[PDB]
Amino acid sequence: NKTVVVTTILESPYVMMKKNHEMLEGNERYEGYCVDLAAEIAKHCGFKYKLTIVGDGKYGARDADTKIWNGMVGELVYGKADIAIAPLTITLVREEVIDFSKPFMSLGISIMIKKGTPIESAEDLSKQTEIAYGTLDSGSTKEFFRRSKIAVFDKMWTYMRSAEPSVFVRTTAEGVARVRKSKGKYAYLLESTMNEYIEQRKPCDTMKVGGNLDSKGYGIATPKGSSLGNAVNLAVLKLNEQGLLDKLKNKWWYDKGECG
């Protein structure tokens, strides 16, 4: 019986530093949707755990050259962590190297704009050059565009991959700042969950426009064939059925939203 090492990522509102973090230690340093979820999962499954922020601050991709996995996925693949509890998208390529619970939350790639930006759809973005647009420099959204056979998305990708200066960002926060500071000349492609969160935060100058480009989910991830998998999956299903997940979403997204 050992302490479970949880890899996660500093991404609001899933995991955030508490106000007095500088005088706090261990799990108490952090707060958020995934901090609450880790607590609920640990309890229903009966384990102790340590929250650790992934070192490279990444979600998880395989370098094409070295073939090494980075991010939280790499943490699991190379045995640095026992479980990942984070807004980590279930994808085919990931499912080939790690296990995922059934989804604890749904999302889709979405478009964030500065209020007043004349854009309603991915098709609008694709037909113009005045407003620039990009995605997270890594992760499942970038990979969606790189791999898409759908004409509109492929056209967006061919623009994005070669835009100068770079339209990609290192973090969600950077994407948000870029939309906010660009006077309507930048739109950010990101998962609907983050988009809806930011829409509820001061200065309330962003919004999600149009439908989602796809439909997918976040799953709790474990090393392939890990014994923890089964219990965590059942825990996620129980929590969903009790309404606890809906409660958590409301708590961190809307309950104390700052935009009325």
Ligand X SMILES: O=C(O)[C@H]1Cc2c(O)noc2CN1
Among 238, 250, 254, 255, contact with a second copy (rule: CB under 8 A): 238
133 SS3 class? strand
Tell me which residues in 117-176 interact with a second copy (CB under 8 A). Answer: 144, 147-150
Judged by CB, which is closer to a second copy: 52, or 226?
226
Gap between the terminal Cα atoms of the chain: 47
**Residues 138, 172, 192, 195: which binds Cl ion (CB under 5 A)?**
138
Angle at 200 between CA 199 and CA 205, to 5 degrees: 50
Taking contact as CB under 6 A, which single stretch among the options 40-48, 131-139, 198-206, 229-237 is the one that binds ligand X? 131-139
Q: Does 59 bind ligand X (CB under 6 A)?
A: yes
Radius of gyration (C-alpha) of the chain in whole angstroms: 18
- 56, two tokens: 């490279």
> Residue 191 CB, nearest distance to ligand X (Å)?
4
Instruction: Please give the angle made by the CA atoms of 12, 36 and 93, to the nearest 5 degrees.
Output: 65
Q: Are 176 and 206 in contact (CB under 8 A)?
A: yes
Picked from Cl ion, a second copy, ligand X, none, the partner binding residue 89 (CB below 5 to 8 A depending on kind) is ligand X
18: DSSP letter: -
**Closer residue to ligand X in complex, CB, 117/140:** 140
Helix, coil or strand: residue 46: coil
Residue numbers at the binding site for ligand X (CB under 6 A): 59, 87-89, 135-136, 139-141, 172, 190-191, 194
* Interface contacts to Cl ion, rule CB under 5 A: 138
